[PDB]
Coordinates of N, CA and C and ligand atoms in Angstrom, one line a residue:
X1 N 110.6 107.2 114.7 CA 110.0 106.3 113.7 C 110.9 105.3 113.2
X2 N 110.6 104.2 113.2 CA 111.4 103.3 112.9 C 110.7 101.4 113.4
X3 N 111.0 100.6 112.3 CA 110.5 99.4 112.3 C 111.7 98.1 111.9
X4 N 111.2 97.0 112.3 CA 112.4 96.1 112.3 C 112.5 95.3 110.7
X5 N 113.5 95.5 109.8 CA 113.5 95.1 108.6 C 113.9 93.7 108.5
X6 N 114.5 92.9 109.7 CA 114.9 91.5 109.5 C 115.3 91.2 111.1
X7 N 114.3 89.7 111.4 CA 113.5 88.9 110.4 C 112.5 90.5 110.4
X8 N 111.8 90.5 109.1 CA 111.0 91.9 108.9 C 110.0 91.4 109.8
X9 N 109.5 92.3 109.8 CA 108.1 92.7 111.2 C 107.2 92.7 110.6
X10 N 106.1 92.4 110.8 CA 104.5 92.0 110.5 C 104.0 93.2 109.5
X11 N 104.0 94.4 110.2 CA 104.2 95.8 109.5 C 105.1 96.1 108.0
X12 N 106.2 95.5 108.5 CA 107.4 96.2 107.4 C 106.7 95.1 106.3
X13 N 106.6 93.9 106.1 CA 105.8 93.0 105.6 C 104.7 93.3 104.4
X14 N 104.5 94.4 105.2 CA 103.2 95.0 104.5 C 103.5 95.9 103.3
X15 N 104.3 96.5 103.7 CA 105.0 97.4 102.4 C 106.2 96.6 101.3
X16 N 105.8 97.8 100.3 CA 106.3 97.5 99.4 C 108.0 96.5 99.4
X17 N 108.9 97.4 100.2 CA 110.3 97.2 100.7 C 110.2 95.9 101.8
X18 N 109.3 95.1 101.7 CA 108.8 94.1 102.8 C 108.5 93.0 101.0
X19 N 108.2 93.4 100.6 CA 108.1 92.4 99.7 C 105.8 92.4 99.4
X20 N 104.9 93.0 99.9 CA 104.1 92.9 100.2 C 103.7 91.5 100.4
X21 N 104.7 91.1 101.7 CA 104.3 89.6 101.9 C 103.1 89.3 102.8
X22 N 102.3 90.6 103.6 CA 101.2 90.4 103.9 C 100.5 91.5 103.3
X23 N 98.8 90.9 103.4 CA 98.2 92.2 102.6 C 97.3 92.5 103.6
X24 N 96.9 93.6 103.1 CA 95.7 94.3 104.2 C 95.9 94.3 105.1
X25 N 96.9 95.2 105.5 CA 97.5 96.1 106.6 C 97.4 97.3 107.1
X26 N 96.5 97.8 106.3 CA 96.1 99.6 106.9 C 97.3 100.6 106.5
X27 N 97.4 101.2 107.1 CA 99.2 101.8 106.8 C 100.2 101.6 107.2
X28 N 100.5 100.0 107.8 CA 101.8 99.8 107.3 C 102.4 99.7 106.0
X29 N 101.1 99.3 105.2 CA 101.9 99.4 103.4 C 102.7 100.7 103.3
X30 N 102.4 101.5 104.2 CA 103.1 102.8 103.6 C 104.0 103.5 104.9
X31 N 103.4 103.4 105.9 CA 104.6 103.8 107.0 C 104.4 102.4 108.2
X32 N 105.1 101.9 107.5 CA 105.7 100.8 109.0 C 106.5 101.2 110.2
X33 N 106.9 102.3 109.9 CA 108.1 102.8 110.7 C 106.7 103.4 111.8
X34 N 105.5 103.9 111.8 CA 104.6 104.7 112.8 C 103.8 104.3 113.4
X35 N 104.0 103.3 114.5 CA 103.6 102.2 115.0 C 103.9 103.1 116.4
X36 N 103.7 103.9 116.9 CA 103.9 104.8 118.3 C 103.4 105.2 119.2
X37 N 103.4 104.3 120.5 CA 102.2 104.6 121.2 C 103.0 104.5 122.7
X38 N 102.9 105.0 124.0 CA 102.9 105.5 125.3 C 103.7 103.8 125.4
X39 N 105.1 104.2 126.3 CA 105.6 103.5 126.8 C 104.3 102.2 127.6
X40 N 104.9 100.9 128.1 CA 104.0 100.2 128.3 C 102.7 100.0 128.5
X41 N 102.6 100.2 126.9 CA 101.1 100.3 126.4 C 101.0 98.4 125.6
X42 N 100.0 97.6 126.4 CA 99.7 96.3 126.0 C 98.6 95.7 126.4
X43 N 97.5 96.1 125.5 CA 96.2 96.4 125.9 C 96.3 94.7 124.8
X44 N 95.2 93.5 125.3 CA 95.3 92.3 124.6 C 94.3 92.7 123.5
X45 N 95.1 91.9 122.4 CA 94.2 92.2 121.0 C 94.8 93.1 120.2
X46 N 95.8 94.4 120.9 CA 95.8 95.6 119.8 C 97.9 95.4 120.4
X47 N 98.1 94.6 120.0 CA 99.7 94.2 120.4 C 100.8 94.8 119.1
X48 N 99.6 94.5 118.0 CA 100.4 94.5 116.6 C 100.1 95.6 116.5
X49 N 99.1 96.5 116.6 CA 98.9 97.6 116.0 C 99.3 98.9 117.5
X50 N 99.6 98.5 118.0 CA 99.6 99.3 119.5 C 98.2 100.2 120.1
X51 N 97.3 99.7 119.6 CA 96.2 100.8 119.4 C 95.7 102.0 118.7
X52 N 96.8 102.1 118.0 CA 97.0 103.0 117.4 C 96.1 103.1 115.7
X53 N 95.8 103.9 115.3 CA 94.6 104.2 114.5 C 95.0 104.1 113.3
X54 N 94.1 103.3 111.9 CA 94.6 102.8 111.0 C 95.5 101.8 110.6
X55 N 96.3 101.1 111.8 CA 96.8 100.0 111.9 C 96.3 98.4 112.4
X56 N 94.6 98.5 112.2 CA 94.2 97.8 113.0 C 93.7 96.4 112.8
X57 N 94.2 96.4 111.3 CA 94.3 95.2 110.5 C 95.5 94.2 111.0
X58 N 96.4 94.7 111.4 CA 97.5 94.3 111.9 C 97.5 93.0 112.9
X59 N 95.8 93.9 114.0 CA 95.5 92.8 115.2 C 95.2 91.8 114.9
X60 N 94.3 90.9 113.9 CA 94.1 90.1 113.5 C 94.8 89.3 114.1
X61 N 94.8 87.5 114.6 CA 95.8 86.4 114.8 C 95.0 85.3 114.6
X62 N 95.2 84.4 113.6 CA 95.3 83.1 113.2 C 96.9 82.9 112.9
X63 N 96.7 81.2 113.2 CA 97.8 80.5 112.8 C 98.5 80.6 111.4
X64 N 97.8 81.0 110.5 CA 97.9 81.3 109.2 C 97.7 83.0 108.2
X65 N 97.6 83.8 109.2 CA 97.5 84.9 108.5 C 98.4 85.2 107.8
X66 N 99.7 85.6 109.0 CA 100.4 86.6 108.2 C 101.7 85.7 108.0
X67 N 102.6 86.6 107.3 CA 104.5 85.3 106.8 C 105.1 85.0 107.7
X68 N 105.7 84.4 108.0 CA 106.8 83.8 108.5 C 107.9 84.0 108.1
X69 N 109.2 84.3 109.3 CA 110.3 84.0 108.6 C 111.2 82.9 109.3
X70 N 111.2 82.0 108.4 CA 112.0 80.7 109.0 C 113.1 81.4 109.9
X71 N 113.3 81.0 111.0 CA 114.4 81.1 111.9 C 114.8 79.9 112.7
X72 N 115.8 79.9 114.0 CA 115.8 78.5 114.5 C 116.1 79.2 115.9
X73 N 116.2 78.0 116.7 CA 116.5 78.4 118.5 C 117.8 78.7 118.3
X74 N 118.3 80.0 119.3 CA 119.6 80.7 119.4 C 119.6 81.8 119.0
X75 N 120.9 82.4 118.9 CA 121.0 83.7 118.1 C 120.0 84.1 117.1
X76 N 119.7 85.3 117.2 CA 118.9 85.5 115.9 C 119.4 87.5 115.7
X77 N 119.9 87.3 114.7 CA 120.4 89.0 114.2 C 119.2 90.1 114.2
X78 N 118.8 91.0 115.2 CA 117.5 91.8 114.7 C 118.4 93.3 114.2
X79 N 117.5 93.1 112.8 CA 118.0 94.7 112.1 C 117.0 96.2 112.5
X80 N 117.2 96.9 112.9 CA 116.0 97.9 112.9 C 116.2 99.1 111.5
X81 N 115.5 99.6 111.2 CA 115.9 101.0 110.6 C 114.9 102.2 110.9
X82 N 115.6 102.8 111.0 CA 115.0 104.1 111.7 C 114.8 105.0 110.8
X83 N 113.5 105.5 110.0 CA 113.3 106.7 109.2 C 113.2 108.1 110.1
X84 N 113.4 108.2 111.1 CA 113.3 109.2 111.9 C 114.0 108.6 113.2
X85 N 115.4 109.0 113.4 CA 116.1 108.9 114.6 C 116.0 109.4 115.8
X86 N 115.9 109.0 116.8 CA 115.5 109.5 118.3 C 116.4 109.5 119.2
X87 N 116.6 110.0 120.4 CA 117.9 109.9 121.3 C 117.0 108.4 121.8
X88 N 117.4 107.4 122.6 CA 116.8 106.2 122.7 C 117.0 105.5 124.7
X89 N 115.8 105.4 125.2 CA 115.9 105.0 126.4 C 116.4 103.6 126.4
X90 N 115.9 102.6 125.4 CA 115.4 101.3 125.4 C 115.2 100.4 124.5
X91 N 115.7 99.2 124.6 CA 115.6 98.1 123.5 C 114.9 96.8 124.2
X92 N 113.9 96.8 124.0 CA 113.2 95.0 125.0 C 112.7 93.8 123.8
X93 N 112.9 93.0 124.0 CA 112.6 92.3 123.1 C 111.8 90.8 123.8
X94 N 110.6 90.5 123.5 CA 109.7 89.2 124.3 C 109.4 88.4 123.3
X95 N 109.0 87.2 123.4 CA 108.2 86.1 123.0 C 107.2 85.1 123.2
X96 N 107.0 84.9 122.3 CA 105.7 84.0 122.7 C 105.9 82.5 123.7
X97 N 105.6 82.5 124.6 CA 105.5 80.8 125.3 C 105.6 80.1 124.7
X98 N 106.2 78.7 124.9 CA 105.6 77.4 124.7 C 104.7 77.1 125.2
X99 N 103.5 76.8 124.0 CA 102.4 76.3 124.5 C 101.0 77.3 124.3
X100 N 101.5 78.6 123.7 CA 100.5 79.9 123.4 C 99.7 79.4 122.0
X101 N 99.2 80.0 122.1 CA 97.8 80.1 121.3 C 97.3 80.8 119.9
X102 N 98.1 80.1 118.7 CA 98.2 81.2 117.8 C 96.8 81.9 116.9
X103 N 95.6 81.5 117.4 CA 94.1 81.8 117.0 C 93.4 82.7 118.0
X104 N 94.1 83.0 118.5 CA 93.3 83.6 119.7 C 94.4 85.5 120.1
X105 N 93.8 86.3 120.8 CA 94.1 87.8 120.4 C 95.8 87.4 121.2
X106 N 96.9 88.2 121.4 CA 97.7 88.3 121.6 C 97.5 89.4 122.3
X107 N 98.5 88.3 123.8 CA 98.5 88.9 125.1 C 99.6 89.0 126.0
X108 N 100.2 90.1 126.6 CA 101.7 89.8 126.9 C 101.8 89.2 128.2
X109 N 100.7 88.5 128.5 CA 101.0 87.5 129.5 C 101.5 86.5 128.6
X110 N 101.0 86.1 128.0 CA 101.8 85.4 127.4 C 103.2 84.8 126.6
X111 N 104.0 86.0 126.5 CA 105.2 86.1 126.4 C 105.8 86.2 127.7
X112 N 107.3 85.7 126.9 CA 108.6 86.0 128.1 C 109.0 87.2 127.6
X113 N 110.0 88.1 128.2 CA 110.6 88.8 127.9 C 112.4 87.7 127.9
X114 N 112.7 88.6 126.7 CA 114.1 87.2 126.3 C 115.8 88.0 125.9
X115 N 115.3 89.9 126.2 CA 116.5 90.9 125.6 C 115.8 92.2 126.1
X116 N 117.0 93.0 127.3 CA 117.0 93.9 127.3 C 117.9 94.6 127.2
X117 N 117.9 95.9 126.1 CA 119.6 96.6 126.2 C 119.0 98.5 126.2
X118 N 120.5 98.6 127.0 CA 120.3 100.1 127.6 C 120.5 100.9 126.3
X119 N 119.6 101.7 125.7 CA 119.9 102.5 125.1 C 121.1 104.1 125.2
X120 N 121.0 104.0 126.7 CA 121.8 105.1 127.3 C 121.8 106.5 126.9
X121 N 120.8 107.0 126.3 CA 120.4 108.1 126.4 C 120.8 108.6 125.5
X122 N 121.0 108.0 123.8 CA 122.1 108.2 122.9 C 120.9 108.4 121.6
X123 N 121.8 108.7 120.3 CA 120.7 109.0 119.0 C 121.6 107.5 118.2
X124 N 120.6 106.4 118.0 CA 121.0 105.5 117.1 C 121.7 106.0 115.9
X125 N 122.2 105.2 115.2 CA 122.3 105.6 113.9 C 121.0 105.0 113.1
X126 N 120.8 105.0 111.6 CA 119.6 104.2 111.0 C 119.1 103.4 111.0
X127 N 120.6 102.8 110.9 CA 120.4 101.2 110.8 C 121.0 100.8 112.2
X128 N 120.1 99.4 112.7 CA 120.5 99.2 113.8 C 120.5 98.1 114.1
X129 N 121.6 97.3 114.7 CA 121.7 95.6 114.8 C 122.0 95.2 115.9
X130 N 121.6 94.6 116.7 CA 121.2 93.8 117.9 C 121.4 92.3 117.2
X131 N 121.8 91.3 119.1 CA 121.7 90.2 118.4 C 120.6 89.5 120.0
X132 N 119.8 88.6 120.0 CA 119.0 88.1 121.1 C 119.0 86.7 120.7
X133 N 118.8 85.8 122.0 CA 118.6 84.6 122.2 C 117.7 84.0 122.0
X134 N 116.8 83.3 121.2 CA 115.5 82.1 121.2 C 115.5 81.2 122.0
X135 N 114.9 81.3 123.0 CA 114.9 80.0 123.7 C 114.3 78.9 123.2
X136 N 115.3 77.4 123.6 CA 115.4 76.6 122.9 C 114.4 75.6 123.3
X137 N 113.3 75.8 123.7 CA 112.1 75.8 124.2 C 110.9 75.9 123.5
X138 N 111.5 76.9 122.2 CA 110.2 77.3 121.5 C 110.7 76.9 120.1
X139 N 109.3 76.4 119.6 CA 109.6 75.6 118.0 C 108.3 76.2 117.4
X140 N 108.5 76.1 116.0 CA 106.6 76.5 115.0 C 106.7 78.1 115.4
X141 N 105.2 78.6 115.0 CA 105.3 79.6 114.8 C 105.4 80.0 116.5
X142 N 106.1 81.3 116.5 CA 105.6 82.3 117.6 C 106.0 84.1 116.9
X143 N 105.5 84.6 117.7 CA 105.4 86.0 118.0 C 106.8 86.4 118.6
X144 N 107.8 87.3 117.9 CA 109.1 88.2 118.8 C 108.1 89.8 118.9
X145 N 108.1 90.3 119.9 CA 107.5 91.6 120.3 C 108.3 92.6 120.5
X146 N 108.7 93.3 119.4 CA 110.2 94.2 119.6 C 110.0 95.6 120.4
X147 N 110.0 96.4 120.9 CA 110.1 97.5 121.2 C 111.7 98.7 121.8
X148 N 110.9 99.4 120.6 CA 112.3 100.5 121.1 C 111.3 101.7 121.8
X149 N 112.3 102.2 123.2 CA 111.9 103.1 123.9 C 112.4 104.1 123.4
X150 N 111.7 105.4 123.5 CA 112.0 106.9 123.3 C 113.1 107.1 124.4
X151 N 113.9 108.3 124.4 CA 114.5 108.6 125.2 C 114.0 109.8 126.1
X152 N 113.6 110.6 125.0 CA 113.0 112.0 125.7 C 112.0 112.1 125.1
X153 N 111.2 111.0 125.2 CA 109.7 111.3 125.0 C 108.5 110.2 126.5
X154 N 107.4 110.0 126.2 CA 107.2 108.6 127.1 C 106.9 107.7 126.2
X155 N 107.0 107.8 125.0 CA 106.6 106.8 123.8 C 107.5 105.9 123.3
X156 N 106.8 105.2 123.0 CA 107.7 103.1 122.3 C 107.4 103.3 120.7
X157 N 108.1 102.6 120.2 CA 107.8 102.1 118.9 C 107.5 100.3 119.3
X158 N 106.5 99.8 118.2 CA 106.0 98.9 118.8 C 106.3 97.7 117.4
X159 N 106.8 96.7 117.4 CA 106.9 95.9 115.9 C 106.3 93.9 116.4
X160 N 105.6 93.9 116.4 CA 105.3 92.5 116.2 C 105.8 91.9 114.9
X161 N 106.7 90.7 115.1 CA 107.7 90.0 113.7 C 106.9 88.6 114.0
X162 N 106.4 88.1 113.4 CA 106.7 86.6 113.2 C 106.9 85.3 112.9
X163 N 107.4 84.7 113.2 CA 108.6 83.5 112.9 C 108.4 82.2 112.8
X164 N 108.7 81.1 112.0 CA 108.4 80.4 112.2 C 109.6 79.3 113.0
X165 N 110.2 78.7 114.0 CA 111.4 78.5 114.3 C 111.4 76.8 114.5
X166 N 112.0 76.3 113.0 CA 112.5 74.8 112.8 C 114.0 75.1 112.9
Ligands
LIG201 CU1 109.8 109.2 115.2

């Protein structure tokens, strides 16, 4: 269990320690970190919430729903924290295209994939910091699709973040 605290995630967002920058989230106001569903699982429409039950407010997509967090092309620091530590297969990280569709359900055709790192079979610590590239291609809002693999399970943690990138 665990969700990405900066730029925060759609989820973390939702809770209090997110600032309740978005509302009406289901239970991420209270567990953002439980977003857990079967290794590549990307069914279009349930991207944010993974399918996963009670989080289903999350799917929603307009250009204006949920926050933003200003970022720009290049480096971008992702923080995770983990309320429950796991030995760890995987770290992937995707985005939205130039040229996607921010009104319409979210579909991982849509995205590139832009960061892959080996977890190598290891137990994170809580806090966890990665750094990944924006391609300099994409500007306004898009979608970063974070997922951490289990190591010894078949299950992902799933965080849809936000961004606006001027
Ligand atoms: Cu867990």
């Amino acid at each position: 269990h665990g969700y990405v605290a900066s730029p925060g995630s759609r989820a973390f967002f939702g809770s209090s320690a997110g600032g309740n920058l978005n509302t009406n989230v289901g239970r991420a106001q209270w567990e953002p970190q439980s977003i857990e569903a079967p290794k590549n699982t990307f069914i279009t429409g349930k991207l944010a919430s993974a399918g996963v039950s009670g989080f289903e407010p999350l799917d929603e997509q307009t250009a204006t729903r949920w926050h933003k967090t200003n970022i720009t092309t290049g480096p971008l620091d992702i923080t995770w924290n983990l309320t429950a530590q796991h030995r760890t297969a995987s770290w992937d990280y995707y985005i939205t295209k130039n040229g996607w569709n921010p009104n319409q359900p979210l579909d991982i055709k849509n995205f590139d994939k832009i960061a892959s790192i080996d977890g190598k079979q290891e137990v994170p610590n809580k806090v966890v910091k990665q750094t990944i590239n924006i391609p300099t291609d994409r500007k306004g809002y898009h979608v970063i699709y974070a997922v951490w693999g289990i190591g010894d399970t078949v299950n992902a943690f799933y965080q849809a973040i936000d961004v606006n990138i001027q």
